[PDB]
Ligand binder design. Structure first.
Ligand SMILES: CC(=O)N[C@H]1[C@H](O[C@H]2[C@H](O)[C@@H](NC(C)=O)[C@@H](OP(=O)(O)OP(=O)(O)OCC[C@H](C)CC/C=C(/C)CC/C=C(/C)CCC=C(C)C)O[C@@H]2CO)O[C@H](CO)[C@@H](O[C@@H]2O[C@H](CO[C@H]3O[C@H](CO)[C@@H](O)[C@H](O[C@H]4O[C@H](CO)[C@@H](O)[C@H](O)[C@@H]4O)[C@@H]3O)[C@@H](O)[C@H](O[C@H]3O[C@H](CO)[C@@H](O)[C@H](O)[C@@H]3O[C@H]3O[C@H](CO)[C@@H](O)[C@H](O)[C@@H]3O[C@H]3O[C@H](CO)[C@@H](O)[C@H](O[C@H]4O[C@H](CO)[C@@H](O)[C@H](O[C@H]5O[C@H](CO)[C@@H](O)[C@H](O)[C@H]5O[C@H]5O[C@H](CO)[C@@H](O)[C@H](O)[C@H]5O)[C@H]4O)[C@@H]3O)[C@@H]2O)[C@@H]1O
Ligand SMILES: *[C@@H]1O[C@H](CO)[C@@H](O[C@@H]2O[C@H](CO)[C@@H](O[C@@H]3O[C@H](CO[C@H]4O[C@H](CO)[C@@H](O)[C@H](O)[C@@H]4O)[C@@H](O)[C@H](O[C@H]4O[C@H](CO)[C@@H](O)[C@H](O)[C@@H]4O[C@H]4O[C@H](CO)[C@@H](O)[C@H](O)[C@@H]4O[C@H]4O[C@H](CO)[C@@H](O)[C@H](O)[C@@H]4O)[C@@H]3O)[C@H](O)[C@H]2NC(C)=O)[C@H](O)[C@H]1NC(C)=O
Lengths: 109, 57
């Protein structure tokens, strides 16, 4: 059952990431964006304190936000939406990313 | 005997400044994050292929 769908999906996935090179860049980025969030959470646990809560959140949310924007890009890039082309779906991504980076550099103070 | 004698002194009691972690631990974690960024930047250029083929001309 599950142990079979596992190989099936792994096959499909690696096939796609090899066929299209760019769909690996985003994936690598997303993987590391997880790690950084985990590192921050581990810090919060290792010290059992979250004194700069503004700072902690500004550092965790920039990762969550970048992850979700990358996934929106990967979905708009694997199968384009009706009125948005691959280009416009990269410029929109850039604008949203820049806005996120600003509000996050304003939150940490 | 109200308000006829010297009065006991009052002194405000303040709170405590929140404890900041010792700089060694913070330095260790900063190093971990820097190593993670480097590992990403090299995973792109090594295991993954960021081809840099189509540089505009
Ligand atoms: C009746 C009523 O209502 N009332 C109200 C009012 O109202 C009113 C209004 O106002 C008016 N207006 C005008 C203009 O005039 C009017 O109106 P109107 O007409 O109505 O109009 P509107 O409103 O607009 O309309 C509305 C609309 C509607 C809503 C519509 C709807 C619709 C619909 C459709 C529906 C929708 C929905 C839904 C759901 C549905 C949907 C769908 C579905 C679901 C399906 O009129 C009205 C009426 O008439 O108002 C007011 C106001 O204004 C209010 O009041 C307020 O309140 C609040 C609250 O309260 C609450 O809570 C509390 C607690 O908190 C409690 O206590 C309370 O209790 C109370 O009450 C109860 C009952 O009554 C009783 O029983 C008791 O006993 C008591 O009494 C409650 O519960 C409060 O709070 C307030 O207070 C405040 O304020 C004041 C001023 O003066 C003061 O005095 C006090 O003290 C307080 O304070 C506080 O707060 C503030 C803010 O808020 C501040 O400023 C201050 O400072 C303070 O704070 C402090 O403390 C606190 C605690 O205590 C804390 O938390 C804080 O902290 C924080 O913050 C800070 C600053 O910002 C910071 O700093 C911090 O942070 C730090 O730390 C931390 C920890 O450690 C850490 O983590 C961090 O990191 C840090 O950071 C820092 O540092 C760093 C470095 O290191 C740096 O970097 C940074 O930067 C910094 O930051 C934090 O934490 C502090 O401590 C008041 O009371 C009333 O109520
Ligand atoms: C909304 O509006 C309302 C009203 O407009 C605001 O409410 C007022 O808030 C005042 C302060 O927040 C409060 O005043 C305090 O009341 C305390 C309790 O009073 C009742 O009990 C005592 C006996 O315990 C009775 O004598 C009294 O009549 C009442 O029945 C008092 O205990 C407070 O006294 C202490 O503070 C004042 C002001 O600093 C000092 O003059 C006094 O000597 C006391 O000082 C001790 O505590 C301070 C720290 O607060 C220390 O700095 C000081 O060195 C003393 O410390 C010793 O004692 C403490 C234990 O108390 C001990 O831990 C320490 O180690 C030392 O041994 C003060 O009188 C008003 O009553 C209250 N009014 C009403 C109607 O509720 C409300 O704030 C507003 N909302 C806001 C602003 O958000």
């Amino acid at each position: 059952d599950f142990q079979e769908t596992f190989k099936t999906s792994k096959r499909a996935y690696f096939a796609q990431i090899e066929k299209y090179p760019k769909l690996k860049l985003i994936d690598t980025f997303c993987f590391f964006l997880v790690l950084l969030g985990v590192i921050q959470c581990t810090f919060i646990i290792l010290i059992r304190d979250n004194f700069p809560f503004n700072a902690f959140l500004a550092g965790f949310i920039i990762c969550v936000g970048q992850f979700v924007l990358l996934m929106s890009l990967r979905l708009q890039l694997c199968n384009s939406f009706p009125g948005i082309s691959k280009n416009r779906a990269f410029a929109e991504f850039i604008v949203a990313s820049l806005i996120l980076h600003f509000v996050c550099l304003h939150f940490i103070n | 005997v109200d308000k006829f004698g010297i009065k006991p002194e009052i002194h405000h009691i303040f709170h405590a400044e929140p404890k900041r972690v010792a700089k060694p631990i913070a330095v260790i974690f900063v190093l971990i994050i820097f190593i993670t960024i480097l590992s990403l930047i090299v995973t792109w250029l090594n295991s993954c292929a960021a081809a840099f083929n189509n540089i505009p001309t």
